[model samples]
Target chain A: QNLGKVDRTADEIFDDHLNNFNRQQASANRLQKEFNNYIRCVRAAQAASKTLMDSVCEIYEPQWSGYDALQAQTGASESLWADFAHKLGDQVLIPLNTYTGQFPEMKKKVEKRNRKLIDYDGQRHSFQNLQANANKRKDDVKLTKGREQLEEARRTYEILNTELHDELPALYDSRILFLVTNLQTLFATEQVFHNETAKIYSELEAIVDKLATESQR
Target chain B: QNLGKVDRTADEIFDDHLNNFNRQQASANRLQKEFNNYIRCVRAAQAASKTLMDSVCEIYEPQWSGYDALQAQTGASESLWADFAHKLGDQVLIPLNTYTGQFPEMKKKVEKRNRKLIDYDGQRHSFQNLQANANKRKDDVKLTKGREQLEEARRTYEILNTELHDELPALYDSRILFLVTNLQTLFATEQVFHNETAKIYSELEAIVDKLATESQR
Candidate 1:
C-alpha cells in the first residue's frame, strides 16, 4: 500500500545544525555575489573616471597654469584606481571565495546522511511489523534476520549522523571568523585606496584653483 | 552650362574665424557628452557602493562595533553622490549648453551671408558683360538698369559681410571667456565634492578600523 511513500524519522538536533549551516551557506554565497558586483562597478567607475579626466585634459588649454601638473596627477589617479581594484580582488574576493568553497561538498554529505536515516527508519518499521505477527513460531528465523538487517541500517545511519553532528556546528561557527577576516581586508583596502586617491584629488583641486585665478586676466 | 554647381569665392579671414569656431563647438560638444557619461558612471558607482555597503551591514553582526556608524555613513555617502551629480548638471553642463547654443544661429547667419556674396558677384559679372558688348549704343538703357541692379546687390551683400566681419572675430575671441568661466565652475564643483567626500571616506575607514580591532576579540 505504501510503495512510493515511507514514514521518515526526524533528528531535531541535526535539523537545527543543518538549518544554521544552510543559513551560513546562503549568507556567504550572497556576500560573494554582491562583492563581485561591487568589483565590477568599481572597474566601471574607474573607466568612467579616466575618460572624464581625459576630457578635462582636452578641454584644459595648453597655455593654462598647472597643465603639466594635471597630466601627472591624472596618471597617478588612474594608477590608484588600478591598484585599488587589484587589491580588492587579491585581498578580499579571493580569500572569501576560498572560505565559501567548503559548502557544496558538505551539503552533499548532509543529503547522503538524510537518505541513510530514511533507510534506517524503513528497516525499523519492517522489523517491528514482523515482531507484531501472531504466527511467531513459524517466522522466528525471518524475525531474527529482519532484526539483523535493522541493526545494520541503524549503524550505517548513525555513522553519518554522528559525523554531521560534530562537523556542522563547527562549520557554522566558522562563519564569524570568515566574515571578520574578509571584511577587515575589504575595509583596509578601501581605506588605503581612498586615502591615496584623496591626496590626488586635493592636488588636482589646487591645480584647478590656480588655473581659475590665472584665467581672470 | 553649370546646372548643380557655382563658383563660390572664399573669404580668407572669415574662413579662419569659422575654423576656430568649429573647433570650439566640437570641443564643447565632446566635453558635454563626456561629462554626462561621467555623471552616469558616478551614479552607477554610487549604486554599487550602496549595495556593497548593504551587504557589509548584513554580514556584520549586530554585536559588531561600528554597525550603527556604517549605516549612517552609508546614508551620508549616498546623499553626497546625489548632490555631486546634481551640481555637475546644474553648474557645468547647463552653462556649457547655453554657451554652445550661440553657434547654431550664428552659423545660419554665416551661411546666409555667403549666399548674398554669391549674388553680389553674379550681378557684378552680368553688368560688366553688358558694358563690354559691341552693340552698347543700342543697349545703353539696358546697361543703366543693369548697373542699378548690381549696386543694390552690392549693398545687400556688404551689410551681412560687415556684420559677420565684426561678429565672427568677436565670437571667436569670446571662447576664452567662456572657457575661463566654464572651467572654473567645473573645477570648483569637483573640488568641493571631492573635499567633502574625502572626509566621509576617511570616517568610513576609521569605522571599519574599529570594527576590525573589535573583531579580534
Candidate 2:
C-alpha cells in the first residue's frame, strides 16, 4: 500500500518532467524539417536542369514525338508526352496560333469588302440582261440602257478595288503582284490552302446582294 | 581538369565544415546519449515500481503468495500480483545478495573452527591416554608434546568462535566497535568465500610454524 502510493507520486513527478523534456525534442524536430526542405529544394533545381536536356533532345528527335503522334499514345504515356509537348508548345504553339488567327481575322475583313464589289457586279448584270431583252424588242432607250449597263458592270467589278487582308500579301509575298493580290486564304484541316475559291464567294455575294436590294426596292 | 581542381577545393572546404559539423554532431550524439541514459534510468525505475503492485497484493489477499503447492484449481487469484512479483525481485535482489552470502561465509568460518577443535580434542585425548603410562616409560614423552599442539590449536579455533559468527554478541556494544571489530561487515559476496577460506589458511600457518619451532627446540 505504501509503495503503491509512492509509485503514484513518482509517476506524477516523472510525467511533469517528461512534458518539459518534450519541448526541446519539438525544437529538434522543427530544425530537422527546415533542413529537409532545403535539401528537397536543391533536388528540384537539379530536376529543372534535366528538363532543359529533355527539351534539346525533343528538338532533335523525329516526328514520333509530334503533337498528334503523342496524342495517339496511351493515357499514361500521353501524360508524359503532354508535359514535354506543352513545354515545347510554349515556344512554338503560341507563335503559330498568333500568326494563324491574325491572318484569318484579316482575311475576313477582306472578304467583307469583296462582298460589296460582288453586289455591285450583280446589279450591273441584271441591268445588262434587262437591256438585252429590251433591244430585242427594238427599243432605242433599251440600247442606250444596255450600253449604260455595260459601263456599270465595268465600274461594278472595279468598284471598291481597295485592298483587304493586306497582311497576307506581306506575310507570303512570293507570288507576283496580281496573283498575290487576287488569291485568298481558307482553312482546310487547320492549314491555309491557297484557293481561287475567293472568286466564287465574291460572285455569290454579289448575286445574293442583288436579290436583297431588288426586293427592298 | 578544371572541375577536378574545383572538386579538390570543394573537398577541402567540405572537410573543413565536416570536421566542425561532425564535432557538433558528436556533441549532439552526446546529448542523445545523455537523453538515452536518462530514459533508461527512468524506465528501470518505472519497471521496478510496476512490479511493486504484485508485492502489495502478496501482502494482501486470502493467502500469502510465496512458494506454495499449487493444483490446476489454483490461479494467481490477486490484483496487482504480477507487478508485485516484479517489484519484489527488483527491490530485494541487491540487499538479499549482500545479506545471504554473508551468513554462508560466516557459518563456514565457524565450521572451520569446529574442525580445528575436533583435531585438538583427538590429540588431547591421545596425550591423556599416554599420560597414565608416561612417567614409567620415557618413550611416551612424545605424547606430552601434544600439549603445545593443543594450545596452538585452541588459539586458532577461538578466533572464529561460534559467538563471533552466530550473533556477533559484542558487535552492538557500541556503533564504533561494531564497525571496527565485525569481520563479516567487511565482506562482500565477491570476497566473502575467499576471505572465509583464508581464515583456515591462518591456522595452517600456525601448524607449519609450530612443527618448525618444535623441531628446532
Candidate 3:
C-alpha cells in the first residue's frame, strides 16, 4: 500500500523499493516457468498411467468375454487423456505464459528506474551541497545550470513513477484471472480423467467377473 | 481309452505309452513351477500398481482433501494384494505342486514296467529260437522259465496299469475343482481391489471439485 515514500532515510527507501521490485518480478517470472513445468509433469503422469492401462489391455487374452469392452474402454481413455492434456494446455498454461511473460519487461523497467533514481539522488545532493560548500553563487550561469539539472532529475523520476503507479496494481489484479483459469480448467480435466478411468476400471472388473463365472460351467 | 492295448504293433504301443507318459509328466512338472511363477507375477504387478498409486498420493498436496481417504485406500489395496497372494498360494499353487509331485513316482514305475516288458519279450524270443536251433534236451525247464518270466512281467504291468486306472480319472476330475477355486478366488480378490480403488478415485474427484469451487470465491 505504501506506493510512495515512507518515513525512512533516502538510502533505506531506495533499498526498500529496489528489493520489493526485484522480489515481485522474480516471483512473476518463476510462476510463468513453473506453470509450464507443471503442465509437462501432469502430461507425463497421465501418459504413464495410460501406458500402464494399455499394457494390461494388450495382454488380455482374446477368449476373455469382455475383450470388446476393454478395447473400447481403453480407446476412450486415450481420447480422454488427449482431451485433458490439450484443454489444460490451452486454458491454463497458455494464459499463464502470457501473464508471466510480462515479468521480464516489468523487471527491466524496474532496473532502469532504479538507475534513474540513483542518478536523481546523486544530482539532487550535489546541487544541494553546492549552495554551501565551495561554489556559493559565485556565477549566475553555473547556479542556473545546477538548478536546471536538479529539475531534470526530478522530472525523470516522476515519469518512471507514473508508469509503475499504473503497472503494479494491474499486475496484482491479473492474478485473479490467472487463478480462475488454472483452477477451473484443472478441475474439469481431472473430473473427465477420473470419470473415464473409472469406467475402464469397471469394465475390467466385469471382465474378471465374466472369467470367473464362465469358467464355473 | 487305450488302457489295455491299441490295434498297433507291440513296439508302437510301447513307444506310444512312453511318449505319452513323458509328455504328461513333463507338463505336470512344468505347471507346478508355472503356478509358483504366476503367483509371483501377480504379486509383482500388484506391488507395482500400488507403488504407482502411492506416488500420486505422495505428490498430492496437504491442502487437498481425501488425503486420509487415499491413505486408507492404499492400505486396503496392500491388504488385498496380501490376501490374494496367500489365498492363491493355498488354493492353486500348493495343490498344483502336490499334484505334479506324483509325477516322479509314477514315472519310475513306468520305467520299471517297461524294462520288465522288454525282458519278457527277450526271454520269449530266446525260448522260441532254442526250439529251432539246438538245446532240445533242455526240456520244459526253458519253457517253464519263459512262462514264469512272462507271467511276472504281466503281473508287474497289470499292477502299474491298475494304479493309473484309478488315478487318471480322479486327476481329470480334480481340474473342475481346481479351476473353480482359482477363478472364484481370483475374481473375489479383483473385486475387492477394484471396489476399494474406485472409492479412492472418487475421493480424488471430490477433492478436485472442492478445490475448483472453493478457489472461485
TM-score of chain B of each: 0.85, 0.34, 0.69
For this target, which candidate reaches the highest DockQ against the unseen true structure? Answer: 1
Q: Where does candidate 1 stray beyond 4 Å? A: A1-10, A134-149, B1-10, B134-149
Q: Give the alpha-carbon lDDT of every model.
A: 0.78, 0.36, 0.61
Candidate 3 TM-score, C-alpha based: 0.51
User: Model 3 interface RMSD, in angstroms?
Assistant: 8.2
Candidate 2 lDDT tens digits, B92-198: 23333343344445446545765787987787777777677555653646657777887887787666553453333232122222211111121121123223323
TM-scores of all predicted structures: 0.85, 0.20, 0.51
TM-score of chain A of each: 0.86, 0.27, 0.77
Preferred candidate (TM-score higher): 1 or 2: 1
Candidate order by TM-score, decreasing, is: 1, 3, 2
**Model 2: per-residue lDDT, tens digit, A62-175?**
432222332222122223333433432343234333433444454465465456667666766777676666555554764455566566655644543433223333443321
For candidate 3, lDDT tens digit of each residue in A100-164?
67777877887787778899999878877776675544465456477888888889888886677
Each candidate: RMSD: 7.2, 48.8, 9.3
True contacts kept of each: 0.46, 0.00, 0.00
Q: Which ten residues in a row have the lowest lDDT in candidate 2 chain A?
A: A184-193
In candidate 2, position B97 carries an lDDT of: 38
